[PDB]
Every structure is written in C-alpha cells, then in structure tokens.
C-alpha cells in the first residue's frame, strides 16, 4: 500500500498484473484481520493505478493475451469476450455484499460493517476505470430458476443507503457520486445513445433518473459522519451533469448543499466550499434564464434563483466569519479560484451567459525591481478586472461594517491570498477604490487603521497577513507617483508610507529583543500599546526553543518574521539616500541578531538597502474573429561601509548551511557588489570563498547533492561576472561535465547556458574562438524546446553584426533539425514548446529556406509507430510547424511545381496504412 | 376543484376579487368611529367571515400557475383580512366549531404567500385529520420569524418588499390567538425535542394544557417561553391568570433575573385601553401632563380648531412611525389617550395639542410617561376584567424582602417596580413604595450607577401622589442636584423625569421652590453646546 | 498603582458573561477606561470603550428581539450610544478618522434593528463623511443603507437627497470600473420610481433631475420596462402600468420592489 503510489529496469508490465490475481484469492481467504488487509490495498491501485496495469484491465481481452458464499459461474479473470474489470465487480460483490437471488441486504452477524466499509469504495474507483462493470449481469450463467424467482443485476449495491451506521450510507453516498463521473466522460455526454447499446446486452433498467434522488437524500442525513461523505460525491458529479444532457437534476444538488452550510461539524463545512470552488459560475448562471419551473421549484416561489449572490455574500464570504482556524483558511483559497468564475450582468465583453461559456473555451483549444510592483503598460482583460472588483466589493465590507473579533480577523487573511495570485499592480482597476481618483493605492487606508490599534497585533496568525497586503497596496503608486521623503511625490500617500515604515522599524525592534534575552526612530519602550507586543512574541519563542521540530512551514514567529523582512524590502525601493541615511545606522543593528533564526529572508532585506543606498464580441469575435486575425497578421510579419561586519557573517554560513532556498539568495549578494563596484576585498588575503563554488560542481556531475536544481541557474551567473574583472577559459570546461556526465538537461544543463549565452552573444582575436565552442554544444542538445530559446538570441546580433556571417548558420541548423522532424527526436510536447519553434523560421534566414527540396522530405513522413500518444503528439508537431514556412516563406506557386518531380504518392497515409501501425 | 375552476377559478370572476377587497377594507376601519345606524349587521356577519376565507385562496392559486397577482392585489386581498381579525364582532365567528376549515385555510395561505416571497428556493423561514395538525404545526415556525425575518429592517428582512412587513406581522399575531391553536403556540421549541407530549382535548384538534414549571428551570428553555406571551398576548379572562402561577414558582439566579421581567409585562396587558390583552389591535395608554387649553372655546377659537386639523394629520402619513397602524390607508389618526372608572377613547383631533413633546410622533411604547400624575388622581379619588387591584397588593411583599439578594438582582428589583406603579389604585398602595427605597441609598454603596439611574424615576412618582411636604422635600430635593453632576450619561436621562413628577401638580414648597434655579441652571448650558451640533451629542438626551 | 488598577476590572467582566448579567459586565468595561485617562494610552482608551458598546447592545435583543418586552423602553439605549460619544472624539484628536467611521456603523445597525428607522437614516450620514476624503466605497456603501432607512421612515422626499450623492462620485471616481459598476445600477433604477411617486416641480427639479428624464421619455433586459413606466403615468394608463409589476416583479430587488408599489396606487 506504500509502493503503488510510487509507482506512476523499470517494474514490468507483466509484473504488476501478478500482484492482481494475488488479491482476489486472498478476498476470500478467511479471517478477519487477512480478510481486511487485501480491501485497503485494492482501493488504492484504483485511484493512483500504476500505468503498465491501467491499461490490461480496461482492454477487452487482457488478461488472456499477457498469458499467450459465491455459487455461480462468475468467469475468472482469464476470460475473453469481457474486460477483467467488468470481472472484478462480479467478484467482490457476490462474497461480501450481496446474495445472489433478490435484493436483499447480507446480514452484519456475516460480514463486519468494518469489513462491508472497504468494500463498497473498490467497487467505485473502478467505474471511473470502466464504466461497464456497473451495469453487468451478477452472475454470468443464471443461478437456478427453480429455487430463485428472478436472476438480479449490480444494482443492489445502490441498496445500502438505509443499512445502520456511517460509512456505508457514507460509502452508498460516495458510490453514486464516480458513477455519474464516469458515464459523461466516457461517451461524450451522450446519455441518450450509450444507454441503449447495454439494455439489450444486458437487460438491467437502471437510468440516472433513479441514483440522484438516492444522493440527494444522504445529503439531508442525520449524523455529521455520514454529512462529509457525501459532498465528496459532489466534487466528482455536478461539473459533469450541468454540462450534460441532465442539467436539470443537476442545478439541484447546487441547490442542496447550499442548505449544509451552517451543520456544526467542522469537516462537514470544509468540503462543501471545495464543491463550491469547482462550479463554473458562469456556466450556472445559463441555466437560471432557461428555467421557468425550476425558479419555483417546490412551494412556487416568486422571483428570481440568485444561485451567485448567495454562493457568495452568504457562503463563502460567510464561512470566513467562523470560529475555526480551520474553516477560516480554506475560504480564501476559494476566493482565488471563483474568480475567474463569475459572470456578473453586462459586461462590456461578454453580453450573454451563451457567449460567457465561449470565452473559456477557446483560450484552452486556440492558441531587477522588487516582487510587488510594476512599470509596464500592463496588457490586461478588460473583463478579467471587473470579477475581480466585485469579490473586493463585499470583503471591504465585513471588515469594516463588522460587529465580530471573528469577522476582522479572518478576512485580513483572505486579501493576503488573493494578492498573491492577482498582484495588485497587474490588476489595479480592480483593486481601485477611491485614492488617487485617475496606477492605484486601493483600500489601504482602512488596514493601517487595524493595525494601529492596540487590539489587533496581539496575535501572529493574522498580523503577519496584513503586512504582506499593505505592502502591495503602496507599490501600485510607482508607475505614477514617482517623480520628507522625495521619491514619493504625492502627499495625499506620505502618511500611509510614514506608517509602515515607522510601522515596521518597530517590529524588527521587538524581534532583536526578543532573539536576545534584553530587557524592554524605532523605539517601543514608551508606548504602552507596544509593550503588548513584546509578551506576543515571547510566547511563541518559548516553544520553537523548547520543541525541537525544523522542518514546520506554520511557526506563527519563524512564519512570523518571514513577513516583517519581506515588506521592509518593499518599501526601501521607494526610498532614497536622504531618507535612510539617518537610518543606515539603524536597520544594520537588528539584522545581526535576526540573521541566525531566518537568514534566507535577511539577505533580501540586505539585497535591498545596498539598490537604494547606491541610487539604484459577440460569439462571432470570441469563437472565430478575435482568432482567426491573430493568425494572418504573424504572417505577413513572416514574409519580412557599515555592511562590512554584516557582509562577512554571510560567507560562512553558505559553506555550512543545506538548505538550498538559502544558497540560492547568497548567489545574487554577490552579483551586486561586482556590478556597484565594490573592490574584491571580501576576501583580503587568501581566495577562501572561490574555491568553494569548484567542488560544488563535483557533487551534481556524480549526483552527490539533493537539490542542485534551484541553484544551478544562479551558480553560474557569479561565476561570468567576476571574469570581466576564474576565466571565460575556465568557465565553459566546467559546463561540459555536466552535460555528458551528469543527470538530465531540462534542470541542470540547459539552466547552465542561460547565464553564459545572454553575457557573452548580447554583451579581439581571443574572442573570436570562444564563439564557436558554444554552438557547437547545443547542436547536441536541439531536442529540447528551452534549448530553441537561447538560438533566437544567436540569430539576431549576426544580422547586426555581420550579414554574411549572418547567412552561414542558418543553413548548418538547416540540415540538423529537419532530419530530426522527420524521426521525431524534438521533443515539442507542450504548447510552451510550439511557440518558440515558430518564432525561428521567422528569424531563420530566407537563403537557407529556398531551396523546398529539404523541407517537403521532412513533411511527408510516416512515424515508427502511431500505437502510444507518446509517439502520436510528436508527429502532429512536425507537420504543423513546417507548414507555416509553406505559407508565408513561399507562395503556392513554388511549392507544386516540385512534388511533380519528387514522387510523392497520396497513398503515403491511407486508411490501409494508418490502421496496420496502431496496431502495430 | 373542478368547480372551482369554472365558477371561480374565470378570469372575469377573478378580477371583482380585487375591487371587492378594496371595498371591504375601508368600511371595517371607520367601524372604531362609526354611529350604530353605519355598523354591519349581525345577520349579513357570517358573509362577512365567509369572504375573508375566499379572496386570499384567489391569492394563492395565481402564484401556482401564472405570476404574483398584481403585488397591488397582494396588498388589497391581505386588507380584508387584517380587520376582521381586529373587530369583536368578526374574531369571534372565525373561533367557533363551525369554522375548522377556514380558520386553518388562512394558516395554509397566509403561510404560502410569506414562504413564496420570502424563503428562496431551498431555504426555510429562519434557521385528529391531517390538515389540522398540518396547520398547527404551520403557525409555530411563522412567529419565530419576527424576530429574525419580518423584524423591520433586519439583514434577513431584504427579502420581503417591506410593504408587507407592516401587512404579514400584524396578521401572524392574530390567527395564533384562535382557541384553535393557542394552546400549541405558547410551548417553546426545545420542548418538543424533550419528551413533553400529552393528548389534547377540547372538542377540537389541540388542547394541550400549560407548561409546567420543572421544565422552565433552565435558562435557554426559559428565554423561548417568554417569547411566545408578550407578542401572542391573552385571551378570554380565564387563560390569564394561568401564566401568573407559572412564574412564581420559578421565584440559578441567571433564571431569578429573567421572571422578575416577564411579571412587568403582563399586567400592561391590562393596562391597555382597548380589549387589554391583544397587541395586534392596540398598545399601551399614555396620558398628556399638559392640560386642556384655554386658547379655544371662543367664536374666533373653535375656528382654531379646523384649520390646523388639516395640516397635522398628513405629516403623521409622512412623518410618523405607524408602531399602531398596520394597514395602508391614510386617515388612521388613533391615540390611545383614555377619557377617565375608565370611560370612551379620545379621538385624536380632539387632543390637538396634549401629547407630550418627549415621544416621536405616534410611536407607542413605554417612554417613562405614561400615566402622568393628573390622571392619577381623578381616577383614584386621592389628592393631598382581570382584577388588576389583586395582582399589585401581591407584589409589594416580594419586592421588598429582596431588598431588606446579589448585586446582579439588586438592579433589575427597583426597575420592575416603577413600570406596575401604572397601576396602584390607593393611596395605602402608594404609601408603601416610598418607604423601602429610602433605607436602601444609606445601605447600599452610592457608586453603582446601574443602581442609580432605575431608583431616581422611582423616589420622585411617589412624592407626587404623596403630599411633597417639608419632611418629604429635604429628602427627595437633595437626590436630584447629585446624579445631575454624574459623568454616566443614561443616568443623566432618568434624573429630569423625577423633576417633572415634582414640579407638575402638587404646589409645591415655597423654600423648595427656590431649588428650581438648581434645575433651571443645568438647562443653559447643555443647549449651547448642542444648538450648533445635535448630530454629535445625542439623540434622547437631547 | 493607577497601572495596576486597570488589570483589577479585566478578571471581572469576563466571569460575569458566563454568568450572563450584561448591564453589569457592561459597567464593568466603563471603568477600565476611565483610568486611562489619569495616564495617557490613546488608542488602547479607546479599546475599553467600544467593549462596553458590545454589551448595551446585547441587552437589549433579550428586550426587543428576543424577549419582545412592552416594559423595555431604551435604558440600555440610551447607555449604548453614550460610551460610543467618547469614542469617536478620540480617534480625531490622534488623527484616524478611518476609525472613526468604524464605530458609527455599529451603532446605525441597530437602530435599524430595534425599530428607529428614521435615527437610523441619521448615523449611516455621520460615518460617509469621515471617508470620503479616504475610501470612496468604503464611504458609498454606508450610503446605500442609509436609503433602505428613509423608505422604513417613510422620507420619500429626503430620499431624493441620497440617490443623487452616490451617483455624484462615481462619476468622479469609478469613470463605471467595478465596485463602482454596481453602485451605478441601483441608482438609475430607484431615482425612476421616485419621480413618478412625487413628480417634483420645475423649481426644485434640479439640473441632474432634468437630464435622466429626458433619456427614457444597466441590463438591456430592465432597460426597455423603465422607458415604458415614465410614458404610462404621463398618459395615466390605468391598464398599462398594471401588467408591468407582474412583469418586473423578478427583476428587481425588493429594496427596489417597494418603491414600484407606491407609483401605481398614486396613479390608480
């Protein structure tokens, strides 16, 4: 039960079906402790199924081509004319919960409802396999007319809704949940035409029409055990249903779990919003104007069915106003995936809820400043921004209309989150209300006064989430403030400013006393409403210090003051000499004593200070129009020093530490004191810290190093910056060994080039040589759709330097990768991978395209096999890439006058030859 | 219902449904102020109970099949109804044998028209035959709702149009003091999640007997009983004295605070000036301090009076707050001021100018004015159904051994004590009063300012039925200059009704006269700050 | 001492609301900050007074709402909003008028709450004006519930004042974004059936009146009934205006379903 989720010479395909056969016998072998060992470990090779084994069951022979209480013939799992799964729900049924003459419950004295729990969620990870077993007869050769009146399918299964206790009503709620799942899914949400191909293979009459309303009712059950167990089944089955053919049930079971909101069991409220995450809110809101009857539904109401604005003003803004610290985080990660959902009325883009669902669809199949901020024009969805304003509409209104210590206190956490995923200086016509009336400061002058209150800050679970949010709501103002304290030059902003920073000067203040036991501009002894803070976090520093446990993302201090150096940085970038040089003093005291407990975010409050002590459509549009334009305007384009006792503290810790989100921060300190020319006196004697970097690079060749990944794209942009000044010689010896004797190019090697390519194309005679090594490298690493990226940088400084240097290489990577295409060796699985090879034959030049001799043999070409979409997706991206030089690099009139030369036959993939290789 | 469709269920037949409901609830209001030429006639009576029943069940069948009816014709047919309810002659008809059927007809309807607005679809209200007990079961879940869904102006009143909120509040009130259901509608809802289930019997469908008492000892179960006697009100004299035995029994100190607060509200069910018992049709008396005038009465003054009839009587359709008046229509013009051996209603054209100027326009509730000590003493000649007379000599005992108990219940004894003083009806009564709380100030500390600010309204009304004589003035004059200087502003606000009942009608001391520059100092001062500026300061101490 | 005074009234208070009194846990609040003024602790004075607001509120919905008494008549009405007279005054003197405005929404939804709905029209103004120079939705949507109170009041005339300050700004801020967008819809929908109710004379017809008028004489569904509405009670239609509140009953709220109801029985 370990070892199969880790399995998705490698362990065979015929090994993984020996483990399959063992269970079945050992299902039946009685005990009750053997009994319940081998039902754990089948409802797990069903949900995370190894791939080899995925595929031999759901096949229609099997099993038969890999060798080449129950009183029936069942037919083992070396039949034909049958899926051995449609075998496996004959078996597990017959023995454990069901008798095979008439529907009728087996009795607990028989089999434990320990043992009758584990068995009804087998039976369900299967139909998510195959979907066919559900609807099978029990037994294949009729069990004995005379003694039982009527022979009866697997739907007696579906008659444990009433049986006793939790888990099995839970476990009967959750086993009509994956067969709704898995029915549109595999006919194509044709309910109509799939259900007439079984009744007459085999005669059962078991339509959708009778399972919703049995999970409709286990919904409204009693207990708050049998409550969690059925809204897991409807995070599987109302995203299928309300596209499909039955939306009508479907918009009731919305409806339902609405009512469950407020039952007293703090799981059965946390997997409601979950099913209340996954809803596409804009598809909801086209069935509300389609329905006439369901707008009345029961007792004939009158008015409208406003499913989203009590989904969201009553529910999901709603549960952050709960007790639990539990139920209040999981709300907010709702928030972050409604709204791309939502659909309000009459928008300036979408009109209809019809051309809504359009626009969704269509993006899917048609195709160095401080993180808070931004200076660019900001290309943004027009329709994007107005979700966005309409959910910090009604959440700026629980914080301050609020009655509740509750209400303010999990709602400063539900803003953190959204700001992490839509920044505020991406999307600031949303986040605008109000400040400078127009780029936005939006909401931050109500959060400044949470925080100056002497209430507020007393706990760290949710004061360390307000100042990651009135960080960001400072920095929207830089693309347009900018030109006490100079740089901000609006002072409707300075007293937000002069807030935090006085803000935060106080906290890395009551953070230096604290990691040194010392006894109570930033100054907290006379204030009275500071002094409570100083008995905040000296509670949870008596903990960390008392319990040893490293690894804890959660600490509430060591999470505590990942917040207070993240918004200090923020901040500096905004300020100037003039404002910190009475403060340079300052903020260097309290980051020798805050180095040792969070040094990975002390560096970045470090990094900072030394930038700024130195200066530095209508359905017509959406489907087709908007689309379709965007392909032929590419086309015609196509036819064209108090640092000094903090700095050395630092170098010691990289030689020791192994932590590597730490060793990747130390690597970018170093890169700045070369560029602001700090003399190479870090060092004064010997060369201590150059010497580590080499034996670095021994232990990732071997594979002597956990995380080489993360560090291995800022290893080498020290090491070319100092050489200007370790040698360009030196440098690219060391790159080699990585390559050829080393782990895999898309994390170590083709990261390694990124640093040395872009400074040494883009930035005499002993420059000339270096050039061609580095080509020569990459010829060998085509394959990869990263390595296409570093090659339209090469291709642009030759028809800038020299032009008739310009024409020799575009023709050496003619005959290189063309050959490839044709074998299929490039790998352009993704669609991150075909945008950047389309960009190339643009930027490749014209001469080495002329002749279509080459490029019409690398088109019409047949694969090895077309039997796995492995090999099938690599083939379709040959053809689609080659023929967008068929269209603009040469017109129709070249291109048909070669093919009468070239015997190309039309029979090349003919509905002979595609059926002989699928097979094959 | 086949023929209900054809012979009614036309729609030619069913548009008069709405110009007949117009028709019904004009002339019900003027019956109040109607000569017995003009009243309906006890004949054409029982036509007049039939029509109530068939007009709301138009209402009901239109949100079925086609729409809202007009939502106009939600607001004509729910007028009919309100008002035979309201009347002696058109309640009683509905409570008989006879009428089993349409007294729980108008429970299924009044309860489909408020869940088809207000419950959205998937929701609820808040969170023997069939259809009798499917209507008494119906009116218990309505009347948990005003607290939470008809409330005017709660978060959960978005829903209703607020139209209605007027129209359906009065109306649930009404059907729960039928003999029908009464008996179920007094038993709170955590009583029958208990095993509490006795068979009913009273030639109807339920006739549970009251609660009793071992089940109010917790304090949860006791907060819900209280609940269903104020809004609910009584009945027939008999079920009156039924609550009384109840709650003394229950006089564990969290349940002594909460009864000696449900024994203040029932005898102002006997205060009230119409039928005493029913707060859908009436509210509490009050009484004008000011007198007649002397203005009127001459040939140019009884042309006074018609002029400015006119001009008051569409501000209150503007300005006012209609705490008496559920209904939609315009000349409700309706104080409750009595006449006093308590006599006729007083018009409200007729007391032009008595109502004191310490209540917003027409708002009806307790306001510490109520009976003002003119009305004290022409009713009971002293100057220096329910027996009412019988349940005031019973509670001075128990007040006062109390006093002669934890600081909790010393503050909610004296303020109990000042409400019932509504209703003393001697002057033994009075004398009593003022003795028991002269020996508490010099006992109990003087720094507890709850305790201060209930006892200042209660020493001075008994120095006002009382002779205000020389050895009553030194002690009730010296209270008054000290919570005047108190920092606690609502105690600020019942020691200037403890001068009123002093300077009213008693003349008073020549000596103690010349403390009236104590009282007339305080009031200069606090009008220049708040001449400017009342926004800031306060409301209802302004 | 007078510090260690202040820690003596803090054990009390809490022993008593499981002990459920609450005049009482509620006199207990107003002492711990009455020695904060003896010293000086600014905005923690202002935490022990607005503790004390929590408590005169609560005991009155056991005498209005819960326990629905005849004899409850506002002592601890008149004590809830007298400890919110000092709070408010001492968030100006520090200089957050942000807090400020935080307060005086506390006190408007209970007024509302206990049946004053013409004081409750009142406070929703006080806390506008304390942020509109700093939030500008924060600030229209203490506005919005200050137009549900005028038509509980009955103040249809002074509910013309209202509607046409909220539109007043968005025009200056929100020119609609957003939060902004739906401020706009329910003010163009309500200041319609308004001005059919009262028909204002061309005196005090003001130049903003004048121009939405002329546009019908926002959802391309409810668009199209609103130009018909104002045509009908210039013609005085009786069968024209009564077969559109069977037909805009679902589309507006029933904030904006009260104001329809009283056009068409002051034209019939």
Known sequence: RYLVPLLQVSPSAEQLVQVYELTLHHTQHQDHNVVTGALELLQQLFRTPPPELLQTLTAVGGIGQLTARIKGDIGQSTDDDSAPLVHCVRLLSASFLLTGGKNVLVPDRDVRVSVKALALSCVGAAVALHPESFFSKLYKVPLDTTEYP???????????????????????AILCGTLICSILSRSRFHVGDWMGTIRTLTGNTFSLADCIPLLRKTLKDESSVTCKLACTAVRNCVMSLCSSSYSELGLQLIIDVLTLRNSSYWLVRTELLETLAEIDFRLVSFLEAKAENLHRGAHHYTGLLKLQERVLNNVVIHLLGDEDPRVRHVAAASLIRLVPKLFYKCDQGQADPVVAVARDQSSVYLKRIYRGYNLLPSITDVTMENNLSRVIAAVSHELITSTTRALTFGCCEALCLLSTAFPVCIWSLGWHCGVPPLCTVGMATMILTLLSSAWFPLDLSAHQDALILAG?????????????????????????????????????????????????????????????????????????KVTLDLQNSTEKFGGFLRSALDVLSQILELATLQDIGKCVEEILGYLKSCFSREPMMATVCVQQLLKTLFGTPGLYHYCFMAPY?????????????????????????????????????????????????????????????????????????????????????????????????????????????????????????????????????????????????????????????????????????????????????????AD??????????????????????????????????????????????????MASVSTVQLWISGILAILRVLISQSTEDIVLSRIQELSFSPYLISCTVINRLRDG | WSKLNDLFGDAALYQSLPTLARALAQYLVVVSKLPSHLHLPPEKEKDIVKFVVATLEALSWHLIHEQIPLSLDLQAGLDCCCLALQLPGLWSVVSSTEFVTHACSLIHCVHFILEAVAVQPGEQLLSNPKY????????????????????????????????????????????????????????????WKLGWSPKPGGDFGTAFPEIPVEFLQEKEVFKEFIYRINTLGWTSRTQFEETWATLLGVLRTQINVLAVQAITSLVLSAMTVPVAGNP??????????????????????????????????????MVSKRENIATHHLYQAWDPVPSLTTGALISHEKLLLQINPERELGSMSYKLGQVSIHSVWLGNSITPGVDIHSCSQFLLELYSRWILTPAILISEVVRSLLVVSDLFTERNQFELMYVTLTELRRVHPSEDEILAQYLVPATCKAAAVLGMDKAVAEPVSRLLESTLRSSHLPSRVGALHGVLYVLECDLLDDTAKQLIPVISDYLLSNLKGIAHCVNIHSQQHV | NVAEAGEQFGQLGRELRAQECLPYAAWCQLA?????????????????????????????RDARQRLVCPAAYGEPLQAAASALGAAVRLHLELGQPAAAAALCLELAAALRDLGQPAAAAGHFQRAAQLQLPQLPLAALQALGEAASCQLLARDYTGALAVFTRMQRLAREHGSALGAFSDVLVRCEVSRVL????????????????????????????????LQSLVMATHEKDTEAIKSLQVEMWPLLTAEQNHLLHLVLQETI
């Not at chain 1, 299964?157 to 049986?163: E, V």
């Not at chain 3, 020695?35 to 408590?55: D, V």
Request: proline letters at 6%; one cysteine or more; glycine letters at 4%.
């Open chain 1, 150 to 172: 009527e022979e009866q399918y697997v739907s007696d299964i579906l008659n444990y809704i009433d049986h006793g206790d939790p888990q099995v009503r839970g476990a009967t």
């Open chain 1, 472 to 544: 960001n709501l400072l920095a929207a103002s830089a693309p347009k403030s900018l030109r006490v304290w100079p740089a901000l030059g609006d002072r409707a902003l300075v007293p937000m400013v002069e807030q935090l920073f006085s803000h935060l000067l106080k906290v890395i203040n009551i953070c230096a006393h604290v990691l040194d036991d010392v006894a109570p501009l930033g100054s907290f002894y006379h204030l009275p409403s500071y002094l409570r803070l100083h008995d905040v976090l000296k509670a949870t520093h008596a903990n960390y």
């Open chain 1, 629 to 813: 334009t965007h392909f032929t305007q590419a086309l015609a384009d196509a036819s064209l020093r108090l640092f000094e006792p903090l700095v050395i503290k630092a170098l010691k810790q990289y030689t020791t530490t192994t932590c590597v989100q730490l060793q990747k921060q130390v690597l970018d300190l170093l890169a700045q004191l070369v560029q602001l020319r700090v003399n190479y006196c870090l060092l004064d004697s010997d060369q201590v810290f150059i010497g580590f970097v080499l034996k670095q690079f021994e232990y990732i060749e071997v594979g002597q190093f956990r995380e080489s990944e993360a560090i291995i794209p800022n290893i080498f942009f020290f090491l070319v910056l100092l050489s200007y000044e370790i040698g360009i010689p030196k440098i690219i010896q060391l790159c080699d060994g990585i390559m050829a004797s080393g782990r895999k190019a898309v994390t170590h090697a083709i990261p390694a080039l990124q640093p040395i390519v872009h400074d040494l194309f883009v930035l005499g005679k002993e420059l000339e040589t270096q050039k061609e090594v580095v080509v020569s490298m990459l010829l060998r690493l085509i394959q990869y759709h990263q390595v296409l990226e570093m090659f339209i940088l090469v291709l642009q400084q030759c028809h800038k330097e020299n032009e008739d240097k310009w024409k020799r290489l575009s023709r050496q990577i």
């Open chain 1, 816 to 865: 290189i990768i063309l050959p490839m295409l044709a074998k299929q060796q490039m790998h352009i699985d993704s669609h991150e991978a075909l945008g950047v090879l389309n960009t190339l034959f643009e930027i490749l030049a014209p001469s080495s395209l002329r002749p279509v001799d080459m490029l019409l043999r690398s088109m019409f070409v047949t694969p090895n096999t």
């Open chain 2, 132 to 191: 009798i007990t499917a209507a008494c079961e119906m009116v218990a879940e309505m009347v948990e709702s005003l607290q939470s869904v008809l409330a005017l102006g709660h978060k959960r009143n978005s829903g209703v149009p607020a139209f209605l909120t007027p129209l359906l509040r009065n109306i649930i009130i009404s059907l729960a003091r039928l003999p029908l259901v009464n008996s179920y509608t007094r038993v709170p809802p955590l009583v």
């Open chain 2, 280 to 317: 859908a049709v009436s509210c509490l008396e009050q009484q004008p301090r000011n007198k007649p005038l002397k203005a009127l009465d001459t040939r140019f003054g009884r042309k006074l009076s018609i002029i400015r009839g006119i001009v008051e009587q569409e501000i209150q359709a």
């Open chain 3, 32 to 60: 711990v900050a009455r020695c904060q003024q003896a010293l000086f602790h600014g905005p923690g004075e202002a935490l022990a007074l607005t503790e004390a607001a929590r408590l005169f509120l609560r005991q009155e």
């Open chain 3, 194 to 225: 308004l001005l059919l109710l009262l028909q204002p004379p061309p005196a005090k017809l003001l130049p903003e009146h004048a121009q939405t008028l002329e546009k019908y004489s926002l959802p391309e569904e409810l668009f199209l009934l």
